[PDB]
Design an enzyme around this catalytic site. Structure first.
Site, PDB file in Angstrom:
ATOM      1  N   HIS A 117      85.191 -11.782  13.473  1.00  0.00           N
ATOM      2  CA  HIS A 117      85.578 -10.562  12.743  1.00  0.00           C
ATOM      3  C   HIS A 117      85.586  -9.248  13.531  1.00  0.00           C
ATOM      4  O   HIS A 117      86.445  -8.399  13.297  1.00  0.00           O
ATOM      5  CB  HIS A 117      84.703 -10.378  11.498  1.00  0.00           C
ATOM      6  CG  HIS A 117      84.788 -11.505  10.517  1.00  0.00           C
ATOM      7  ND1 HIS A 117      84.014 -12.640  10.620  1.00  0.00           N
ATOM      8  CD2 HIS A 117      85.540 -11.662   9.401  1.00  0.00           C
ATOM      9  CE1 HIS A 117      84.290 -13.452   9.615  1.00  0.00           C
ATOM     10  NE2 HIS A 117      85.214 -12.883   8.862  1.00  0.00           N
ATOM     11  N   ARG A 122      74.818   3.744 -13.399  1.00  0.00           N
ATOM     12  CA  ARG A 122      75.811   4.784 -13.646  1.00  0.00           C
ATOM     13  C   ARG A 122      76.620   4.406 -14.883  1.00  0.00           C
ATOM     14  O   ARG A 122      77.097   3.271 -14.992  1.00  0.00           O
ATOM     15  CB  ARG A 122      76.711   4.985 -12.419  1.00  0.00           C
ATOM     16  CG  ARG A 122      76.006   5.703 -11.267  1.00  0.00           C
ATOM     17  CD  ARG A 122      76.976   6.134 -10.172  1.00  0.00           C
ATOM     18  NE  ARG A 122      76.346   7.047  -9.216  1.00  0.00           N
ATOM     19  CZ  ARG A 122      75.684   6.665  -8.123  1.00  0.00           C
ATOM     20  NH1 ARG A 122      75.555   5.378  -7.829  1.00  0.00           N
ATOM     21  NH2 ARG A 122      75.149   7.573  -7.319  1.00  0.00           N
ATOM     22  N   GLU A 140      77.432 -11.380  14.187  1.00  0.00           N
ATOM     23  CA  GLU A 140      78.344 -11.355  15.323  1.00  0.00           C
ATOM     24  C   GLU A 140      77.850 -10.436  16.445  1.00  0.00           C
ATOM     25  O   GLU A 140      78.031 -10.753  17.620  1.00  0.00           O
ATOM     26  CB  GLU A 140      79.778 -11.071  14.864  1.00  0.00           C
ATOM     27  CG  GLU A 140      80.310 -12.229  14.007  1.00  0.00           C
ATOM     28  CD  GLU A 140      81.734 -12.062  13.513  1.00  0.00           C
ATOM     29  OE1 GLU A 140      82.449 -11.152  13.978  1.00  0.00           O
ATOM     30  OE2 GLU A 140      82.139 -12.865  12.646  1.00  0.00           O
ATOM     31  N   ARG A 190      68.737  12.237  -8.312  1.00  0.00           N
ATOM     32  CA  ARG A 190      69.151  11.842  -9.667  1.00  0.00           C
ATOM     33  C   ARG A 190      68.313  12.461 -10.799  1.00  0.00           C
ATOM     34  O   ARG A 190      68.765  12.509 -11.946  1.00  0.00           O
ATOM     35  CB  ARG A 190      69.148  10.311  -9.819  1.00  0.00           C
ATOM     36  CG  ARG A 190      70.007   9.516  -8.821  1.00  0.00           C
ATOM     37  CD  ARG A 190      71.453   9.300  -9.281  1.00  0.00           C
ATOM     38  NE  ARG A 190      71.584   8.659 -10.595  1.00  0.00           N
ATOM     39  CZ  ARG A 190      71.716   7.348 -10.809  1.00  0.00           C
ATOM     40  NH1 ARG A 190      71.717   6.484  -9.802  1.00  0.00           N
ATOM     41  NH2 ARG A 190      71.843   6.896 -12.049  1.00  0.00           N
TER      42      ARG A 190
END
Ligand code: NA
Ligand code: NA
Ligand code: NA
Lengths: 251, 251, 251, 251, 251, 251
Positions: free
Chosen positions: E6, E166, E78, E221
């Site tokens: 990838h 949320r 990787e 929050r």
């Protein structure tokens, strides 16, 4: 027409019965009822065949559950709505322990919950335990008829194949978590497999109802013989005699 | 003797049938078979009543499953051992969505697994998904007969009462994890409750068998009416017509 | 500046589009969009590259999801806030069944949920099932271009190694519950591994959104060949043609 | 040196004993032993105090478990290695049912597994069930001494505080899954909370060992009074009398 | 061709680098690399943008992970195959505790595993814990530059929306098990939500790799303000300074 | 008489102590306390032996926990009610990694939660992570005395046998999910087994309390030698010196 959704029964049909004998097979109901006094067919709807009879002058109901927790849970709920408070399961079963022989009697103290319906009544941590008075009556009744009795744990499976690690099947496959499971149960002292006790016992123990279970051994999977029809019939009658005798002490 | 443990059938009984229509009720099998050619009673053992019929010159079997995954799993396995590769379930059901009306038809693409028997074939992560050819045939059959059809997800419960959040019961209790569960399913677009599809679909999809399910709506839990017996029977017959028509295109 | 947190898009950018084609690779977005009319680059933020194009006179959006359920869930939510109601995933994939060949097309009916994000929308018992209209359009589109098509279940993994039982890795280790898992999926008829469908399908099926998935096979792990760049490009174009043709029928 | 890792005992220390009475508190062991003949201190290592005594001419061991499943599991294993095959737990407890009064006696048929150690012997599906001979002996012993006895299920918790829903604590917090749990157990007919039976019963039932448990009620959570120290001691002595009497019938 | 599937990198591309700084955003990689010596673009494949730089004469790699555990797991594996043994994550985050202010710095000791990919490396019981040398280096780097630092637990979610509770979303729905979850985490002292640390930390801690994570607070929050773009960039740069300084002490 | 339910201590007994050293063995408490100034026995109830001492002019409490999470959770809660905010566990342990030698010191960053009590404070996804300041002080203290130190993950088991995969036992059985578990932990870099850290660390991290753990290695199960009493005593004193030195920096 009926007072309940499935059983096709009214409160009047039971004539005050508060105890039920609950076999799996609708065809076994007549045989059990006719051991008692004044037996009468009540109703037959789906897998639920019901007969009323009299034991020591008291009405008792015999009602089939069908195979598995789901149909069992319906039978128990609707019988409860019709006034049944005590449920005695009678069966014939295999065994998975070398010391248990064909013709022996098994009294179940509690079940390994390999079902789904028990979870609809209590979380997995809750024990699928039988009622002490019911278990006591079954043990005493077995002793009174001179049975060879084993008392202990039963593995209660939602399937009659994979869940019981059977490989002579269409796919020959057993899912990973059930592969090697029988050996696990054997090592833990589990007596046998059947398919209704996990639901029956969990449901009753969490709903203020009394439940017990007795079964006659027809085959042993560690020393597996083809069962003889003569012996199976005798074992069935032997176990039925026990469940009726136990019921006499729970009225 | 029979070739299977529970169904009381031999291989020859099916006369080459590889498709089964599988309703729940043993007493409903005959009526389905008589839609087709040369309907014949095969067996009635426990909750398993089976009839053979011919559809477009091909033998087909109609066999009841009883209520719940456990007995369904037995019927499917033993029918598979007898050569059945395609299983179509027909039922009647209560809807949990406001837009679904009494008399409407539901084709189930997949089930919410609120059963135990499905786990005996595949872990929970595996989808209880219907076969695409079966689903397509059912959808096509529904629209060919002018049905009002809804296609989607069904909640498949091991119980009729607490698992479907019924409170008018003996105890009036619903265990914590099922309390408020109906609202959860409704919010996710689940169409209805029944009791066998999770087992049927999971078992077939993991065993190289094809399965589909169709049901007629007899009640809606969000706008609840007492069903008319005539309407129930008409909706039942309508759904049965659809399952048979679908079967013609799967032979 | 943007109407959404991640995608960098406004409602106006979509010009009324209600259908999205969602590949994984941001670099594949341009290639798909340019198959349709009046293609235009909209935005490129993080793993989310979006193009608008026109299909039969109607605006359609092509938007990359990135690898995995988490980024997929963001793309689906924010596209939904921008008016997208139908999502068609296009991919290239390996296969794990001997009968599936390189160049074949896979249409996913449902996913094995080996992810984490699906659980943020529905509990595990809920099926990761595709929308019937979407699956139907994909199957019809594959047939129209003469594809060799397999329809069924896909295993959807949060990892591209361990979760797909790859051992040629840094540690060479696969955690216990994933060790032997590929053989389990193979025995259950699962077609292939990928990394987004469990989230995509669960999310859409529980949120009133339509989703389907199609993929072209570039390798088979039971008969593993090094893929040729020429064949991979042809297979990619073949699958892209199918997803665009399916989209024409879902507008 | 000792024959076991924790208890500080040799095989010879037990002088042939195959039955153990297993209270929680090390400082309570001596008082139990002195009910019987020739009580002798064997060892005091960590929380494990052991005394030998003779009951009807047979050596018996009284050994503390400490608080909780982990230390209980050590005591049971090492006593088993020293030849103990029967384990009777005696404790004092708080009831959670209105009908159970201070001074009443509880015999536990099975436990709700709110512990961790039981899982080290059997999966959650396995019942934490007491041995029937032990339970019978305890019930008989209770009724022989004129006790007011309740027979049923006990919730067995790995904590004294949050797992039993106590809020008068340092944080005043109870984690979500335990918040409201007491009401759940009450609704299912659970009698009481304690901290060792889930481990003790599961371990013994899966290892071919016999176990039972009896407890005296010192407080009722539904009608909560501060216990009188005199009453506590009297109820403790009453329960100890029952466990010893039961032991006589298990030799 | 590349050495990995990838990332589009060869072993030689890293020029001996054994430490990686791993931000989420591909478009943020360049800015981090240019803090160090001889920054060079290595590759941009999918969501994986990588740059090489030199820190105190040692080659280092900066590589984006994309959003979520799945793509993170690919990047870590990787990079490990390319010789990276140390992974430092840098991000920006929203706090859920009243005492944490915008512009503050969070060093994560361990993560709440609300992801799926971590389970592909270790069962849930395994801690998603950071490497002590990495954590120490980050704490030291934070205090060396005059940061206001909080050290503790981070909730790591596979979703941005429902998993972080949320509700201003397309459906406005949050599934049962995540509804009220934020309050639960707050009560347990969890500092913040992000989306990659559960995977990163679990994977590295179980694969013999070292990992740490630092983040700058951009919103709280419990006292929610719209962030200023200037402040966001300044906090981002502040956190990036800390991660680079920490890296100097891990070479 | 006492201010708490189990420990038999009053607020006055602690004389303002806010830090506790918590060994498992009640017999080890005196040895630790006597390393500090003005040591005095406070109380001994059940497995809870407590001593007060003075460190750099400040009162410190040493209190035993007993074996296992349940008794540990009681000690931590009741010490917290008596004003303790910092808890330092000191132990002796085996090791399961070849590179760890007898006499080496282990500092635990986090625990594998193979217990039950941790779940009574936080769900499984929550990390059983140690406090950074505590871990830092322990590492620095080990370095100051010239110890060979390993820092990392500990497997914390509710049992001292099966859960630690011991087969030289009464039944010789290890339940399926624990069979092969030691090799799993070894492959993931886990240092050792013990029995209290999962509960201690989870409880403290979720309750606003600080916890750390240090242990001296007495045996290695990959190169298993019979421990020498001389070396075990030296290792115990070595570890005790470290925990006291660490405590000096946390007052
Ligand atoms: Na049935
Ligand atoms: Na203890
Ligand atoms: Na991504």
């Amino acid at each position: 027409k009926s007072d309940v959704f499935h059983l096709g029964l009214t409160k009047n049909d039971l004539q005050g019965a508060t105890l039920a004998i609950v076999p799996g097979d609708p065809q076994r109901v007549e045989k059990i009822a006719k051991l008692m006094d004044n037996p009468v067919h009540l109703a037959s709807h789906r897998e639920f065949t019901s007969w009323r009879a009299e034991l020591d002058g008291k009405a008792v109901i015999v009602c089939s559950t069908g195979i598995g927790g789901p149909s069992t849970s319906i039978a128990v709920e609707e019988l409860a709505q019709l006034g049944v408070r005590t449920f005695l399961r009678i069966g014939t079963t295999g065994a998975i322990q070398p010391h248990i022989n064909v013709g022996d009697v098994l009294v179940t103290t509690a079940a390994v919950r390999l079902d789904g319906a028990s979870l609809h009544f209590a979380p997995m941590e809750f024990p699928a335990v039988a009622d002490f008075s019911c278990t006591t009556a079954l043990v005493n009744a077995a002793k009174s008829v001179g049975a060879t009795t084993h008392i202990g744990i039963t593995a209660s499976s939602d399937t009659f194949y994979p869940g019981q690690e059977r490989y002579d099947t269409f796919s020959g496959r057993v899912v990973r978590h059930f592969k090697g499971s029988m050996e696990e149960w054997q090592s833990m002292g589990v007596m046998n497999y059947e398919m209704e006790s996990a639901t029956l016992l969990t449901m009753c123990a969490s709903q203020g109802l009394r439940a017990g279970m007795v079964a006659g051994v027809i085959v042993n999977r560690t020393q597996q013989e083809i069962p003889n029809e003569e012996t199976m019939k005798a074992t069935e009658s032997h176990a039925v005699k026990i469940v009726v005798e136990a019921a006499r002490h729970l009225l």
